[PDB]
Design a protein around this ligand. Sequence first.
Ligand code: SAH
Ligand code: SAH
Ligand code: CL
Ligand code: CL
Lengths: 448, 450
Amino acid sequence: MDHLPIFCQLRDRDCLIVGGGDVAERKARLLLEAGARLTVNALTFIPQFTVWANEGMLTLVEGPFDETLLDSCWLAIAATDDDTVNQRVSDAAESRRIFCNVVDAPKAASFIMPSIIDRSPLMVAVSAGGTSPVLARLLREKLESLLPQHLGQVARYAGQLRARVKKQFATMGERRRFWEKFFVNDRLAQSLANADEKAVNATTERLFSEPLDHRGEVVLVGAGPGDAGLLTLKGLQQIQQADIVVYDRLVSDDIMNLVRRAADRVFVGKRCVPQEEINQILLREAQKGKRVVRLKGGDPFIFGRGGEELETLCHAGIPFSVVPGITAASGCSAYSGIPLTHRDYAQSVRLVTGGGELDWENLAAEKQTLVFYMGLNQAATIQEKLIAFGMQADMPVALVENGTSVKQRVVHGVLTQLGELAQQVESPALIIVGRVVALRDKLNWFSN
Amino acid sequence: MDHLPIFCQLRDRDCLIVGGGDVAERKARLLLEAGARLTVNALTFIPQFTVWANEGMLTLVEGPFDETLLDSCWLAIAATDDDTVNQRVSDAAESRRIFCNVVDAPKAASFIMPSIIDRSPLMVAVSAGGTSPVLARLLREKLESLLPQHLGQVARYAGQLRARVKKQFATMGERRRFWEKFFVNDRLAQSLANADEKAVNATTERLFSEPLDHRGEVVLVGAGPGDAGLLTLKGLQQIQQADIVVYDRLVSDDIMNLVRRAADRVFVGKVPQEEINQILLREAQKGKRVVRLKGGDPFIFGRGGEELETLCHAGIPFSVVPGITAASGCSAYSGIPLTHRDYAQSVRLVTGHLKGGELDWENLAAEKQTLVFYMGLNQAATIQEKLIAFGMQADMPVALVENGTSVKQRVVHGVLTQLGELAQQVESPALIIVGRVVALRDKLNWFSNH
Ligand SMILES: Nc1ncnc2c1ncn2[C@@H]1O[C@H](CSCC[C@H](N)C(=O)O)[C@@H](O)[C@H]1O
Ligand SMILES: Nc1ncnc2c1ncn2[C@@H]1O[C@H](CSCC[C@H](N)C(=O)O)[C@@H](O)[C@H]1O
Ligand SMILES: [Cl-]
Ligand SMILES: [Cl-]
């Protein structure tokens, strides 16, 4: 153990920063966030410091380092470019037994500032003693994605329920299992963050009244179009807490590798499976008291039949929520260099599927970006109908297969080639029609 | 934040523990492992303090509390079962500006001792400030299974290489690129764990020999519509690594809280477009990792294309991270699915703000679609008038979602003949949704009613 981590209470304690540039501004913001009573001593200050000074959030002392500014200080930070000044600061702090950090020389003085993940009152700190700040960042990154943004409010509320938990749950083991489902309960975290004090109370007594091993809910999670980096933080957090994950073929294998190892997996994709068995599967797993994640390709509410699955759950009294995902159109647009809107090119974007028939007159109108989902089989018809209803023959068209994935393929041309272009791709694929398609020559940054 | 975590260097620094029982023993063990010069002042001591005193590892002072023992100290710990004594210690420490922990009273005095995961020199500390020891324990145990034990040897080797990296690589960008490759080479980690110095040396020499991509870059990142949990994993990695983040009014404060503290932030709010272009260009040509952070999705009414065209003209590399557009976010969080079993064949994302141009109202009035108007609040009265005049039924359900996905989300709803009036009950940023799917809110709304 090279350093001892301690969590300091800085509120209304005098602290000194020496320096007044960008580096000192970052440290000053951190200490202000911690509630420090801050003096900043520098030869010159960048504008952010004078702003804070007139707002009375700190004190500025312009001029050379004055060691007597340390006389009632609890922490000192030397944040200048000048090794000689930093050494004067760290020597003066050391003689007064004030913990001191030199930003550009972590091993020079008496404390190191770690990477911080703030979920107050819950806090996580990572440091490798100045050996490995890039590693500390890589870990901080990971932890940021894993810790829900509102976990702190849950932690405060947990403190208030401690006495109730121990009187209800006689044993440490039973308590532990309660806390485990308490700290992952989604409606609790969201009710707390929304100040929905009635929803807090309803979730709170469902947690005390339901059987200890029951934690039944359903979360519809949008997996995005393929690239595992396009999952949301919340979607990752939910699949890390699932007892059961129900997924189909349009959820990428890369996404499924992020699923909690101990979660049961139920594949409902087509290896011809109707929708009602899926609705039933979700119903029964949740009634078992399990935490069910329904993982869907893209966004659950865009041609995903997500509403159909939730209506099944609504009458049965099963709590549910929805985590939106990147729909295929947004993902393919970004990864093929084809923005769905651009300047004057398109006043609107239409997301359309390939009883009833498409309004071909409507689809042919100018100033649109058309995006066809599940439309490959209708591709030759789309070419002839658009041409037959007045869309200009030179209108650019593109097809994007397996968008955002490492096997993405993008074919392109003009509308008179559309039916022939669709031959060269297979599902899952998008058809994009409109002037924005021509922008791919400049904006394609991904590799085909 | 409730506390500021700091990692203190205690070697040869005087510390004091008051108390001589099991609690004091556990804190003493930590301070001794950190190299502190430790005095323990207590009326009685459990036997482990004798063993340590006999080995010369600390000093015992048997007796009541001696305030003067704090005189040379950097830290103090009150670890008695006597709350009156503990408060005398914390008062004496306070007067001397000595950080002090009262073990049985986390909210009193001036520092808390966190739970520690040791991968020395790598260390992770976790605490809930006494509010929930169970949460800290559960987190501590999960982080423990997440951090491989090889990490300590990797970090130790990195520390040994730091002098060489500084001498061989002139710029900050080059050194960062070296470290990013160093810390994810699994073979190097295994070779360190096996004490295989030939393999360590071979991989190391190859790593120092690789060229580094000296170029700055611009990443367009979609922040999503507000809820910080809706940022993508890749988007988070971009803003946790960026040198500069250029952001707008429509990027929520909670998203900005995920931008790493070391990045410079540049607010381009109220700034015309080609002035933003100029900022991105200037910073990227200086070799920085630039993120342009935009509300929602960058390629849906974001002007994301114009920015990228300027960079392509200048030879600057760029990429795009899509985000959750306002339509998808407000859909999920208001309980209004954008499509549903032949309620809606089609979704139309439309701007309500054009460059003498006018929308194709015949087209927008078509049946069996969901209309979503972006920046249409000021035009809501005209939208109602035109949709009615081109045949949309007067009772078509409509909803307006203000600050969708945030804790301040407000939803108002009604029928098309109320759209102009409903719009005066909300302010920007708001989305207008028109379509039969709006009626599904009563059965699918899970978020709140504000
Ligand atoms: N990675 C991908 N690349 C191109 N198209 C995709 C795709 N993933 C899904 N799609 C499209 O979506 C259709 C299935 S409908 C499901 C759509 C999904 N809810 C979403 O939001 O994207 C496929 O036929 C295909 O047209
Ligand atoms: N959180 C939010 N709630 C409601 N509407 C929002 C919103 N965030 C953005 N918008 C809408 O988006 C408009 C700006 S245009 C920018 C849209 C963004 N690129 C996206 O993909 O969503 C605003 O006028 C408002 O209509
Ligand atoms: Cl480090
Ligand atoms: Cl705690």
